[PDB]
Design a protein around this ligand. Sequence first.
Ligand SMILES: Clc1cccc(Nc2nc(OCC3CCCCC3)c3[nH]cnc3n2)c1
Lengths: 297, 258
Amino acid sequence: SMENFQKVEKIGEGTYGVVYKARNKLTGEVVALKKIRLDTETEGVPSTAIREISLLKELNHPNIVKLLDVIHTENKLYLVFEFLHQDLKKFMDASALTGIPLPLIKSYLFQLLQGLAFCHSHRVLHRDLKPQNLLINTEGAIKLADFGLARAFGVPVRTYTHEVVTLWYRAPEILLGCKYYSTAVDIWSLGCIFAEMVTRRALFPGDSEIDQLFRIFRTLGTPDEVVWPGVTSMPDYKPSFPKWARQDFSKVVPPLDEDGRSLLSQMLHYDPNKRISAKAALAHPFFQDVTKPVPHL
Amino acid sequence: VPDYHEDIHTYLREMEVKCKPKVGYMKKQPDITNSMRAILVDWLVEVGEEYKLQNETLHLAVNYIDRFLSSMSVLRGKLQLVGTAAMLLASKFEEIYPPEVAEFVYITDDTYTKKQVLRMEHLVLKVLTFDLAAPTVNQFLTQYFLHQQPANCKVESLAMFLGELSLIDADPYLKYLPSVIAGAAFHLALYTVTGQSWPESLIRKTGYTLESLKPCLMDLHQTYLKAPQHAQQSIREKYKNSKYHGVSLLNPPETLNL
Ligand SMILES: Clc1cccc(Nc2nc(OCC3CCCCC3)c3[nH]cnc3n2)c1
């Protein structure tokens, strides 16, 4: 079943399973294989694989990792995916003495926004956007990957899982216990990623939920009823929260130009209703000169 | 947050045609019948109530059973096993805390083993080729509810109730797409509770008018009128609860004047 694939090395482990680099012996295609250990008399096929496969077979897009096949054995399940060369986190690491050239940053964000609008227009929430789940190739593409925490949503949304998003990229409405979250949580993550590509350090690296909330509040101001109607009634909202004054965005990501700051501040708006959708962000003046430089590795 | 409401609606319209079960499959099933499928669905409604599952979970399980039975011949003693595996898969896909496999094994009262449930889960995945994100009547209802002037909780729960009743009876409801059943259930609920009719803003959205909803609506009306007599009664009982505003013992209108 796996007869025509030749394993090359282990790539890593994400939300569930294990990923390897492999080579199709007959066609030459290099692929990533995500091995899913099943068993039986356990839970059967994990809900994470069920959601990942059914959603990725629907999501055909240049900026979304392409699921090529599913090899479904009595014992194991193997997801065959197009092979990407590196993760954004490793690329930023490799660039941290020099920095990522502005045009590559803009192209990467433009591409991420396209992948994300396509997800959201197909009723899919990603819910784990972070630099290690964003994969680049040597032709300048960048693609959303690891849909292990994703889910299909309904209009209007109902309550979904609370334990979502790695903490440094987690939106405020999740941190505060909102009953309903939606597509704005993936935009907040991407806005933290955009800042991180530019400063090359995580915008809000908290070590706990309340630390994460205070880090966000010291940068954007502690939210009130004016900025975010309803904030004070949120479940984990506390009247004892320190009231920090909002920082001037030119000080938040100092190298960003006016267009860039305007775009980042709309991706980090507190109120998920005012936070910019991915579709609308693609027409932001920041991208008027977007091109596609590649990366290197 | 309506930036994608129309892209999503358009996409669900495209996918419900691709997820559509085969309209006359029961006449190709040697051993099972419409009435046997009614008994299975009624039972799944009871299971959803017992583990407090979402209504969407129920609608997805049923879509999985109808698509599985569309290409797989099943003996009557195994129909519950297919329905159990489908309900397990739908719980995994849609629920925050699905029941565990042992809970599914227990509620078949040990008719099957855990090993058979897990082997059937895999068979259903392979038959449906892992394509489980199917549009449901419930997903179209919820988008239609947004057009209400003002919102009416009785209208919503009664449209859910009517949409659910259509799951039980393959004949006639397997002919109608999820969006159309939802349009009939929304109009019927609205007319029963308020006197109002399918709004003009939903003709613009959907393209459906009362004339195009007419065949489904005539079918749904009769189902509504005859509900108290149907051999399956778990949906009327579930909709006696206050969680659903007691809508099942609202009186159906005698005529629709269409
Ligand atoms: Cl050396 C190298 C370095 C990074 C990536 C990759 N390649 C690659 N990895 C995947 O999952 C990688 C996975 C690793 C753990 C964290 C989540 C992502 C893929 N899924 C579809 N295509 C994929 N391509 C390779």
